[PDB]
């Protein structure tokens, strides 16, 4: 059989698993070993977006699950534990396993139990693993997926950085950025109409202060998985090119491409060389996913500018919107304060500040000045101050036709922004009212709910 | 021109066409021939799922249509007959034909008529053929697609088994597994929201007793088509790897991959070597298709276990759900008995038995015992017996919070199963009531319809 | 760095940009140059379909935007102007640019302004460029995408014809072919449910008298982009095969394929050799896109028939429906006349004539004769004449069961055609009534609206 290099030798190895976005060290070994993998399923609430909770089902407490790294020809003794706090039974199917269910029938594990099975890793490559418990789509949609790397016997070529990025489509009862604990929505899942499309299980998991890092001149390998359950990723890096893309354990290697399709349940190894400094965006280039559902991750490159290659500026909020900033923690704080009934004006102002970036600043500017005659000012705006209820209607339903703001005529079009949630409109307008010599006061989520109910 | 090896020689050959999942023998020929292909369009009702009828439009009486096998450089004389019972006109477009419409303008055929056209098979490869009659999407959605293989002149490498598997997306007015004759739904088709995603034109067409077969050590070639009309298949084999994947007549061959994207209207040849015994599942890994819409097929491998490669068990209903069993004929029988007005308790019990597998057994076990303190028993359940109407509400709408069953406390969550149809809930609960010393009696589809109407 | 061949030499070149479907001449140069690209954003109403207006946002006044052609190693000085009539700010991200945002942060341009940035073209290949202004999906959905070709240093192999074809998905408030100025629909865009899927920004942009042309024996290169924003194209040529397909700047080249997947934001170079005369259809083979949403383009090959290769007829309206004809200008004229309140019977008749092709003629024939006993006549039809209101109901809601037409019995099924708009049903039936010795008169859109409101 391929990838059979004899029985295990040396000592049994306890696999060291890593949490995303990090990868275990290269196995750096010339002999086949018995590798003991211990993975524990944990069901738990986590933030899928600021102020939005979701009950994830996880391998190892993360989405995606712990990264497993072995060598082709290793005997893997796989232990799956199901934490006693679990409500569901779980199991595992690893791609790249040779045998029925990729482990599923022998890994069936009730809450508080443990199962084990053994397999030889015959197939080199990068592989998705996932839960295989009826209803299979529900388990995978709740975050039950990760990657296993089966190294070639000589190891992969040395790089400066290895990272772990996995896309998933998620199905909430509520709309995108609707606050609260969001249940799983089976109807959206069956229709393949996700509310979120994420890297590593949350909006902003790999942006701002959670960006991946490297330096000019360094090489980066990324193990990229698509857990699905349903979407195919038009996986793309903005402002850069992949030196190589290799799918699973495939013989074919594509070189010098920027855009590549990753099947549902598929995995690829990509390699990048950093040439110039700045933020490189990993996206699903089915563009409403990347810019309206959360499918964006950042690789931040530090080092010397090369004006002969690129004369231009670092990414800002015009392109990355509200993810240009280090974090949106102010949104989480305002949401918690609403729940507790302690929401202050300043809690709203700081949340609105975070959300104004891109969403409003692209036209009205970061300082609210606009552009005289083209985009009207929000800074010390007589039109804003004259009618705060009309301002709520303008955000939700748009504005067009001739208006006068601060003594100048505008005759343009502000598109409707009906996709903003009531708390988002309230916090943004509270921010604007409390900035730039505007009159202060506040807009409440209830205020906006009433305007939404009758335009 | 490529693939032109002179005029036809020998005798004219009458092509021998096969029904899925079988393929005609290798042409085994060193000379170009005149090949006469006779294909007849038949419109007819068939079971798309147990107790669910659909009017298919077929090439040769099957979905997918009869497999056509010729050699590169053959002159093909193509005869399309439209059966007199047909209501629609039909035609054909074969991929791999060199000429406008791939045959469409010269194959236009009214009910009870016959058309013919001739083409040289210049392009080697595996190709989709399909109907090309306005409205083209409706004809293809009704099952009007198949494969034509144009062998290379030296033939393909010898294998132990060749099979024919074709994916299709289907659009019923009714929901998944809603019983009766289901009309085509143009609105779902335009929106690309299929009710079924199938291999070979039915749920269970290639599962249980209709599985594909081979033995350990044997090689299997599968000609895989995607008739669409609309979906792209994340085509995957669970627990195995493809030795080779080749698309259409492409020069590129990918090797050692498990997951591959097949375009709408695309076709690939895959090759598999059986290493260990068990059931290998072919799926569209857009996972709600495979596990909620019917997109699963089985290759069953017989032979000696190899514990050094895989220590684990054969696939069961935890992963394959209600398709683990040889067939679900009891569902078809119960549906026919409802139509006739002769439905008995035992008809319901046998249907419920089939549907309980996976759907309920994953948590409550095949014997209804559950797991004390974790999953409550359905076997001799005081809680079930106390309130059969509450049991209908629990299946449709779920259950959570503290309950007492057979003297033990449970504090867990049973998800809602609202996607089950009224007859399915009725038959499952009738099965449970008539098993395991439960009190007997029955639940009717009308009973469940009323509970669904007011939770 | 790759593709760095020293500083620019010779004179600065002012790039000559072309409108689709044409491409600039090969750069035909042995030295790296400074290339000055000037591109202007124009927002403007254009016909997305006959009688259907849309406000496109364009690079250079077209969808897709002006084609840019440079050589690997050129220094590109990129000037983006935003026309003063613009309401939105715009920018650019070019795939294949090495640097953050592919130009986005340094190309931010308010109406009536100009921005510039410089980049070295290190990466050879074909690349999408698009707007990168929040909300990014809205800008791309409004048509803000095109192609840039970075030639290899020795140039591409010489061909007879080069063309420029780019797919896009579009999101109108109204349904497909609903007349009037159609606003952008953010809700459809987020759900990835386009109303139109087009080549080069309109239905019929590359059909009939706007077809691409070549002659038997000639080679055609097509630069194929997928602007998205959301869809993946199952890109296919009907009745022909691609000699080569190469994605972006990839090392891999696939040969001899008919069907290939182009990611959202992806681009490919395809090469075709014309073997026999006729119309070759480029489609997205997600078939409801091609035949129900506009995703069809034609390459028309003139020259000598080769009966040894293909004995069959040129494409007609059975396959291409209402796009078989040179244009559907009569629909545009009837729509304008309705708006003006000058709609005549003959305006309706000429519009109906155009729309009857395929839609009705596939069964009732181009002359309305039908096929005795199989498809009833519309020519001098007693059944039509007896009840014009019943004819409106038959088009919208279908007909089945026994009928008598012109003294012969029919017992067949005419499917419902509810997707036709009220003006389309009115114009088709006015055409039929005024043809073939039928009694004349007219059906109005208001007539059909009332029948639609109560079947
Ligand atoms: C450009 C695409 C804009 C974005 C994004 C947002 N706004 Fe806007 N806004 C814009 C225009 C062109 C106009 C004038 C419309 C016209 O009829 O000419 C406006 C107007 C407003 C107003 C009222 C006028 C004023 O006080 O300056 C308000 C209060 C306003 N806009 C607020 C606002 C907020 C809060 C935004 C993000 C949520 C936002 N706008 C986005 C253009 C654009
Ligand atoms: C796990 C994912 C389950 C599946 C699949 C099904 N059921 Fe279930 N069921 C489950 C739990 C954890 C509970 C207890 C909930 C709580 O509040 O603690 C239940 C409960 C029931 C009951 C009532 C209690 C009893 O009689 O044991 C019934 C009647 C029941 N479940 C039926 C049932 C059927 C018929 C199923 C398939 C259609 C099914 N359940 C699936 C967990 C799970
Ligand atoms: C085949 C797929 C058809 C298409 C496309 C259209 N029509 Fe049709 N039509 C068809 C049949 C088989 C029948 C008879 C149905 C039966 O019960 O046997 C009809 C009937 C009509 C009629 C009434 C009878 C007559 O006058 O001949 C009308 C007025 C009619 N059809 C019109 C019509 C138009 C305008 C179409 C395009 C919009 C059209 N039909 C499409 C079969 C088919
Ligand atoms: Cu699980
Ligand atoms: Cu899988
Ligand atoms: Cu047909
Ligand atoms: Cu086709
Ligand atoms: Cu723009
Ligand atoms: Cu892009």
Three-state DSSP string of chain A: CCCCCCCCCCCCEECCCECCCCCCCCCCCCCCCEEEEEEEEEEEEEEEECCEEEEEEEECCCCCCCEEEEECCCEEEEEEEECCCCCCCECCEECCCCCHHHHCCCCCECCCCEEEEEEECCCCEEEEEECCCCCHHHHHHCCCEEEEEEECCCCCCCCCEEEEEEEEEECECCCCCCCEEECECHHHHHHCCCCEEEECCCCCCCCHHHCEEEECCCEEEEEEEECCCCCCEEEEEECCCEEEEEECCCCCCEEEECEEEECCCCEEEEEEECCCCEEEEEEECCHHHHHHCCCEEEEEEECCCCCCCECCCCCCHHHHHHHCCCCCHHHHHHHHHHHHCCCCHHHHHHHHHHHHCCCCHHHHCCCCCCECCCECCCCCCHHHHHCHHHHHHHHHHCEEEEEEECCEEEEEEECCCCCCCHHHHHHHHHHHHCCCCCCCCCCCHHHHHHHHHCC
Q: What angle do CA B301, B304, B309 make, to 5 degrees?
A: 90
Q: Which residues pair with C233 in a beta bridge?
A: C262
Q: d(Cα B62, Cα B57) in Å, to the nearest integer?
A: 9
CATH architecture of the domain covering A1-155: Sandwich (2.60)
For chain B, the residue count is 455
The dihedrals phi and psi of C322, each to the nearest 5 degrees, come to -65, -5
User: Roughly what angle, to the nearest 10 degrees, separates helices B345-356 and B422-433?
Assistant: 100
Q: Are A83 and A43 in contact (CB under 8 A)?
A: yes
Homologous superfamily, domain A329-455: Cytochrome c-like domain (1.10.760.10)
List CB contacts of B63: < 8 A, sequence separation 6 or more: B20, B46, B56, B143, B145, B166, B168, B200, B201, B202
Q: Is the CB of C396 under 6 A from ligand 3?
A: no
In angstroms, the CA A107 to CA A91 distance is 5
CA distance A124 to A126: 7
- Nearest to residue A76, comparing CAs of A106, A108, A32, A114? A32
Classify C292 as helix, strand or coil: helix
Least Cα distance to B379 among B325, B427, B439 occurs for B439
C-alpha B81 – ligand 3 centre gap (Å): 22
**Residues C370, C399: Cα–Cα separation, whole Å:** 15
CB pairs A-B closer than 8 Å: 197
CB-based contacts of B404, cutoff 8 Å, min separation 6: B383, B410
Ligand 2 within 6 A of CB of B360: yes
Tokens of B120: 């040289």
Euclidean distance between CA atoms A255 and B448, whole angstroms? 58
Other Cβ atoms within 10 Å of B7 Cβ, number: 11
- Inter-chain CB proximity C413 and B135 less than 8 Å: no
In three-state secondary structure terms, C125 is strand
> Could you give the count of Cα atoms lying within 13 Å of A449 in the half-sphere of its Cβ?
5
Tell me, what DSSP letter sits at residue C177? T
Q: Are B268 and B182 in contact (CB under 8 A)?
A: no
Whether B192 sits inside 8 A of C310 (CB atoms) is: no
Quick one: which of B377, B442, B437 has its CA closest to B405?
B377
How far apart CA B406 and CA B440 sit, in angstroms, is: 18
Does ligand 3 have an atom closer than 6 angstroms to the CB of C412? yes
| A260 neighbors A245 (Cβ within 8 angstroms) | yes
H-run or E-run covering C298: strand C296-302
Which run of H or of E encompasses C79?
strand C75-82
Cα(C311)–Cα(B142) distance, rounded to whole angstroms? 28
- Which residues of C are part of a known binding site for Cu cation? 90, 95, 130-131, 139, 144, 285
**Annotated binding-site ranges of A:** 90, 93, 95, 130-131, 139, 144, 285, 360, 363-364, 381, 412, 414
Per DSSP, C372 falls in state T
State whether the beta carbon of B377 lies less than 6 angstroms from ligand 2.
Answer: yes
Give the span between the Cα atoms of A261 and A267, in whole angstroms: 10
Both tokens of residue A114?
Answer: 């443990």
Contact A16, A23 (CB under 8 A): no
Q: Is A401 exposed, middle or buried (0-12, 13-18, 19+ CB in 10 A)?
A: exposed
Beta carbon of C378 within 6 Å of any ligand 3 atom? yes
Give the whole-angstrom CA distance, residue A19 versus residue A69. 12
Q: What are the CA-CA distances from residue C6 to residues A214, A240, C34, C70, C120 (Å)?
A: 27, 21, 11, 15, 10
CB contact under 8 A, A91 and B415: no
Instruction: Mark the residues whose beta carbon lies below 5 A from ion ligand 7.
Output: B 265
C-alpha B376/C-alpha B374 separation (Å) is 6
Q: How many residues does chain A have?
A: 455
Give dist(CA A98, CA C334) in Å, integer: 65
CA dihedral A384, A390, A395, A400 (to 10 degrees): -90
Distances (CA, A) of B438 to B368, B386, B427: 11, 11, 15
Could you tell me the two tokens for B445? 């589809």
Instruction: Kindly state the tokens that stand for B179.
Output: 């019983």
d(C-alpha A267, C-alpha A126), whole Å: 6
The count of C-alpha atoms lying within 13 angstroms of the C-alpha of B135, restricted to the half-sphere facing its C-beta, is: 21
What fold does the segment set C156-328 form as a domain? Immunoglobulin-like (2.60.40)
Task: Tell me which H or E stretch contains C244.
Answer: strand C242-247
How many other C-beta atoms are found inside a 10 Å radius of the C-beta of residue A440?
11
CB B268 within 8 A of CB B260: yes
Residue A155 β-bridge partners = none
**Half-sphere exposure for A35 (CA within 13 Å, toward CB):** 24
Long-range pairs for B406-415 at CB < 8 Å and ≥24 separation? B406/B376, B406/B377, B406/B380, B406/B381, B406/B382, B408/B372, B408/B373, B408/B376, B409/B373, B410/B373, B410/B374, B410/B375, B410/B376, B412/A87, B412/B374, B412/B375, B413/A87, B414/B363, B415/A138, B415/A186
Cβ-proximal residues to B342 (8 Å cutoff; 6+ apart), any chain = none
Both tokens assigned to A256: 């010098």
**Residue B265 vs residues B52, B192, B251, C39, C295: alpha-carbon distances, Å:** 26, 15, 19, 38, 15
**What approach was used to elucidate this structure?**
X-ray
Phi/psi of residue C142, nearest 5 degrees: -85, 0
Residue C81's H or E segment, with its range, is: strand C75-82
Interface of A with C in 398-427 (CB under 8 A): 412-413, 415-416, 418-419
CA–CA gap between residue B322 and residue B320 (Å, rounded)? 6
At C346, phi and psi to the nearest 5?
Answer: -65, -35
**B107–chain C Cβ distance below 8 A for any pair:** yes
- What does the DSSP 8-state code read for residue C162? E
Question: Which has the closest alpha carbon to B77: B153, B12, B133?
Answer: B12
Q: Tell me if A321 and C119 make a contact (CB, 8 A cut-off).
A: no
Residues contacting residue A70 through CB under 8 Å, at least 6 positions apart: A15, A27, A35, A37, A76, A121, A148, A149, A150, A151
Residue C55: HSE in the Cβ half-sphere, 13 Å Cα cutoff: 12
Collapse the DSSP code of C228 into the 3-class scheme (helix H, G, I; strand E, B; otherwise coil) and give the result: coil
Under 8 Å between Cβ of C67 and C149: yes
Write out chain B in H/E/C secondary structure: CCCCCCCCCCCCEECCCECCCCCCCCCCCCCCCEEEEEEEEEEEEEEEECCEEEEEEEECCCCCCCEEEEECCCEEEEEEEECCCCCCCECCEECCCCCHHHHCCCCCECCCCEEEEEEECCCCEEEEEECCCCCHHHHHHCCCEEEEEEECCCCCCCCCEEEEEEEEEECECCCCCCCEEECECHHHHHHCCCCEEEECCCCCCCCHHHCEEEECCCEEEEEEEECCCCCCEEEEEECCCEEEEEECCCCCCEEEECEEEECCCCEEEEEEECCCCEEEEEEECCHHHHHHCCCEEEEEEECCCCCCCECCCCCCHHHHHHHCCCCCHHHHHHHHHHHHCCCCHHHHHHHHHHHHCCCCHHHHCCCCCCECCCECCCCCCHHHHHCHHHHHHHHHHCEEEEEEECCEEEEEEECCCCCCCHHHHHHHHHHHHCCCCCCCCCCCHHHHHHHHHCC
Q: Which of C92, C69, C88 is nearest to C80 (CA)?
A: C92
Nearest to C236 by CA among B262, A231, B150: B262
Which candidate in B177, B245, B318 is best for mutational testing of the A interface (most A CBs within 10 A)? B318
CA of A134 to the centre of ligand 2 (A): 13
What ranges do the domains of chain B cover? 1-155, 156-328, 329-455
> A91 CB near a chain B CB, below 8 Å?
yes
Strand partners, C246: C269
Cα B58 to averaged position of ligand 6 atoms, centre (Å): 8
Whole-angstrom Cα distance, residue A267 to residue B3? 37
Specify whether the CB–CB gap between C33 and C15 falls below 8 A.
no
Contact B78, B92 (CB under 8 A): yes
What phi-psi label fits residue B440: left (phi over 0), alpha (psi between -120 and 50 degrees) or beta?
A: left
Helix (H, G, I), strand (E, B) or coil at C58: strand
Residue A126's nearest CA partner among A14, A23, A236 is A23
Measured between alpha carbons, how far is C98 from B394 in angstroms, rounded to an integer?
57
> A-chain residues within 8 Å CB-CB of B418?
186
Quick check: do C1-155 and C156-328 share a fold? yes
Compute, in angstroms, the gap from residue A287 CA to the centroid of ligand 1: 24
């Amino acid at each position: 059989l391929p990838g059979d290099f004899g029985p295990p030798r040396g000592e049994p190895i306890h696999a060291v698993l890593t949490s995303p976005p990090l990868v275990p060290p290269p196995v750096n070994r010339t002999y086949p070993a018995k590798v003991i993998v211990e993975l524990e399923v944990v069901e738990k609430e986590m933030q899928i977006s600021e102020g939005v909770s979701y009950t994830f089902w996880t391998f190892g407490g993360t989405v995606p699950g712990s990264f497993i790294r072995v060598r082709q020809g290793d005997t893997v003794e796989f232990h799956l534990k199901n934490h006693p706090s679990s409500k569901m039974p779980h199991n595992i199917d690893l791609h790249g396993v040779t045998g029925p269910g990729g482990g599923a029938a022998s890994s069936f594990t009730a809450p508080g139990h443990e199962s084990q099975f053994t397999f030889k890793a015959l197939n080199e490559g990068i592989y998705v693993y996932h839960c295989a418990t009826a209803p299979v789509g529900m388990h995978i949609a709740n975050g039950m997926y990760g990657l296993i790397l089966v190294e070639p016997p000589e190891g992969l070529p040395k790089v400066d950085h290895e990272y772990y990025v996995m896309q998933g489509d998620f199905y909430t009862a509520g709309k995108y950025r609707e606050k609260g604990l969001q249940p799983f929505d089976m109807e959206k899942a069956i229709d393949e109409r996700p509310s979120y499309v994420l890297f590593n299980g949350a909006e902003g998991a790999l942006t701002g202060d959670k960006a991946l890092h490297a330096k000019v001149g360094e090489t980066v390998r990324i193990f990229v998985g698509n857990g699905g359950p349903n979407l195919v990723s038009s996986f793309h890096v903005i402002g850069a090119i992949f030196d190589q893309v290799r799918y699973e354990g495939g013989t074919n290697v594509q070189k010098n491409v920027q855009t590549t399709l990753i099947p549902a349940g598929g995995a690829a190894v990509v390699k990048f060389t950093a040439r110039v400094p700045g933020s490189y965006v990993l996206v699903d280039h089915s563009i409403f996913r990347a810019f309206n559902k959360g499918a964006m991750a950042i690789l931040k490159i530090d080092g010397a500018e090369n004006k002969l290659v690129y004369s231009g500026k670092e990414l800002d909020s015009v392109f990355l919107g509200d993810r240009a900033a280090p974090n949106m923690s102010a949104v989480t704080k305002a949401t918690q304060a609403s729940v507790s009934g302690t929401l202050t004006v300043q809690d709203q102002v700081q949340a609105g500040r975070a959300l104004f970036a891109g969403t409003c600043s692209v036209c009205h500017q970061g300082n609210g000045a606009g552009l005289p005659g083209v985009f009207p000012p929000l800074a010390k705006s007589d039109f804003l101050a004259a009618d705060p209820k009309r301002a709520m209607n303008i955000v939700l339903h748009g504005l067009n036709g001739k208006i006068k703001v601060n003594g100048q005529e505008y005759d343009s079009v502000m598109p409707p922004m009906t996709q903003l949630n009531d708390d988002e409109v309230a916090n943004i307008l509270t921010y604007v009212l409390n900035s730039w010599d505007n009159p202060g006061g506040r807009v409440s989520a209830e205020d906006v709910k009433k305007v939404r109910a009758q335009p």
